[PDB]
Design a binder for these strands. Structure first.
Ligand code: ZN
Ligand code: ZN
Ligand code: ZN
Ligand code: ZN
Ligand code: ZN
Lengths: 76, 80
DNA sequence: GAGGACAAAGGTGAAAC
DNA sequence: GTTTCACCTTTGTCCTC
């Protein structure tokens, strides 16, 4: 089953160049559209899992970038 | 269509934790579960819960939330 | 596979307690 | 010092395009 490369939830298909779920798709889209900056309250190593993806916006967004979600896939 | 809070009789803003409820009972239930807060009734666990008296007993207000069907599991452990 | 509508989650802080 | 609640923001679903 296609897994979301960000969080391990079931992927709905490719989004912004990468196998991802609707939740991570929507989160990445909002983050880019608003130029929203987050910062980790731990040390930028928060676990991102389907059951625990909302614990840190900063680490979730960094994981999106890491797995190859593309800023320019989001329309201005 | 106008809907009433099943807990206290205030105007409901929507469904919260599975039940028609106002913003106050939603917030109260959310705080209670997030903190695993235990309350105790000073009377005999039959305090009336109304718009005018929802503040008088945390214990009875929380038990009423459970009674009308508010769901502990609708409160996410996944948060900041 | 892009974005948007939107219910129902979540967070907040002045005022109430 | 802690708790309440009106008014916010964010999340994730499901839909048109
Ligand atoms: Zn399989
Ligand atoms: Zn995901
Ligand atoms: Zn973090
Ligand atoms: Zn209520
Ligand atoms: Zn009581």
């Amino acid at each position: 089953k296609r897994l979301c490369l960000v969080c391990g939830d079931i992927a709905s298909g490719y989004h912004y160049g990468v196998a991802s779920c609707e939740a991570c798709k929507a989160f990445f889209k909002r983050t880019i559209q608003g130029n929203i900056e987050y910062s980790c309250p731990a040390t930028n190593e928060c676990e991102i899992t389907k059951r625990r993806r909302k614990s840190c916006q900063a680490c979730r967004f960094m994981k999106c970038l890491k797995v190859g979600m593309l800023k320019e896939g989001v329309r201005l």
